[PDB]
């Protein structure tokens, strides 16, 4: 039943999710803000994300940034990532099926089944990964994006980015309610902003009390400022992804979000086809044979058939009960025969 | 040393495997020498000059 | 509550300077209340004799 259920679009969503987080990582590490650790003035980096829509189109910084971002995304082990993701997914489905199956007891037999699935997937893993990298070799060189793919990436980026924003804002508001009033966290935020500017100094590597704020309160204020800046950047990039300037494909360096999402979807789908063939069919064919062979060999080699019987308390007493009755019957038969051979 | 020799040998074979893998995924196994780089760049410059 | 001094920048949700000003304020409070009570008591009728 499960094998009839699984198929290939499930693998597509599975890969597209791992690659979605890969996109967020690459994009965030190349474009967005870095954390606040101390209370010293940070020198403002020359190029900033707020001035990206209004930037010189032939900017070596933004060009190099989006280019190293994409090359970093493509020259990753996408073959091995797809292979291991599909592997963990298939194995997990087998483990759940095992949970609902009759092998909830007998953890040895259960482990034999699980290890059978694991060894099959492990056997096929390399061929799937290498084949996926070879099949992706043309899209590593030129992941040329068609206007329709660009639109798809456009619609996906809005959702991915806003989900990242909602996680950020919910964490901010919970921080407010934890520290106390929104206004009080606004006070510690104003203090950390002041110390981040020249307005006030603290001279502390680990400041305990400054302006009347505790050591924990300072940490909560820095955390609040980082969350704020990341929220503003996120909303700004959402507005940019919904902007009219990102609707067209010609502004690829101006819209890194949409471009990186398009590359992710493409790589996911072409990798997914080879993955389903090379790996999924191989699992459906090898798995039943491996289960039967390993279970029989386990029972007879390890003597775990007798333990399989001993394990369930009900069948234990059953297999025990029969012989004692047989012995008493044979005893009575012997006495009854004794009386017949000797009348008295 | 002789005892550790076998395990070290197998591990060396493996890291030779991984170095080859990085050579496959990141540079597509393109052979490279200094002379090849210089000649290619010189021809690029000559095309620009033409 | 008890606090240790591994990070002398922030303790509680209050800054180091705010904390110091708070210690001074509490001392001033306690000594003021005592002083006023003792003045009014020294002016009390029971201190007449």
Swiss-Prot record, chain C:
Localization per record: Mitochondrion intermembrane space
Function text: Constitutes the soluble short form (S-MGM1) generated by cleavage by PCP1, which plays a central role in mitochondrial inner membrane fusion and cristae morphology. The transmembrane long form (L-MGM1) and the S-MGM1 form higher-order helical assemblies that coordinate the fusion of mitochondrial inner membranes. Inner membrane-anchored L-MGM1 molecules initiate membrane remodeling by recruiting soluble S-MGM1 to rapidly polymerize into a flexible cylindrical scaffold encaging the mitochondrial inner membrane.
Protein name as annotated: Dynamin-like GTPase MGM1, small form
Organism, scientific name: Chaetomium thermophilum (strain DSM 1495 / CBS 144.50 / IMI 039719) (Thermochaetoides thermophila)
């Amino acid at each position: 039943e499960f094998a009839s259920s699984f198929g290939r679009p499930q693998l597509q969503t599975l890969l597209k999710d791992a690659l979605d987080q890969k996109v967020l990582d690459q994009l965030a590490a190349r474009y967005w803000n870095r954390p606040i650790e101390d209370l010293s003035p940070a020198p403002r980096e020359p190029d900033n994300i707020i001035d990206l829509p209004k930037a010189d189109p032939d900017s070596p910084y933004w060009h190099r940034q989006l280019d190293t971002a994409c090359s970093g995304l493509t020259r990753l082990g996408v073959g091995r990532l797809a292979a291991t993701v599909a592997a963990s997914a298939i194995q997990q489905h087998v483990e759940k099926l095992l949970d609902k199956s009759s092998f909830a007891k007998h953890p040895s037999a259960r482990k034999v089944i699980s290890d059978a699935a694991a060894t099959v997937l492990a056997d096929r893993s390399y061929a799937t990964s290498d084949g996926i990298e070879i099949s992706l070799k043309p899209y590593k060189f030129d992941p040329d994006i068609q206007p329709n793919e660009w639109a798809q990436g456009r619609e996906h980026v809005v959702g991915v980015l806003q989900a990242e924003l909602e996680q950020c804002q919910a964490a901010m508001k919970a921080l407010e309610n934890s520290v106390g009033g929104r206004k009080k966290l606004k006070e510690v935020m104003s203090f950390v902003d002041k110390a981040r500017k020249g307005e006030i100094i603290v001279e502390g590597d680990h400041p305990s009390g400054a302006g009347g704020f505790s050591a924990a309160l300072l940490a909560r204020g820095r955390e609040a400022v980082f969350l704020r800046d990341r929220a503003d950047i996120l909303s700004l990039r959402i507005q940019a992804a919904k902007s009219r300037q990102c609707k067209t494909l010609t502004n690829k360096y101006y819209c890194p979000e949409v471009f990186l999402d398009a590359v992710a979807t493409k790589l996911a789908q072409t990798a997914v086809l080879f993955l389903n063939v090379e790996m999924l069919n191989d699992f459906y064919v090898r798995f039943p044979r491996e289960v039967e062979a390993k279970l029989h060999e386990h029972m007879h080699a390890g003597g775990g058939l007798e333990k399989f019987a001993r394990e369930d308390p009900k069948v234990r007493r059953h297999l025990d009960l029969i012989r004692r009755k047989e012995l008493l019957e044979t005893v009575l038969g012997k006495i009854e025969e004794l009386h017949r051979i000797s009348s008295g | 040393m002789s005892s550790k020799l076998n395990e070290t040998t197998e591990a060396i074979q493996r890291e030779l495997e991984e170095t080859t893998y990085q050579f496959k995924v990141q540079y597509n196994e393109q052979p490279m020498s200094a002379e090849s780089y210089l000649a290619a760049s010189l021809d690029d410059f000559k095309h620009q000059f033409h």
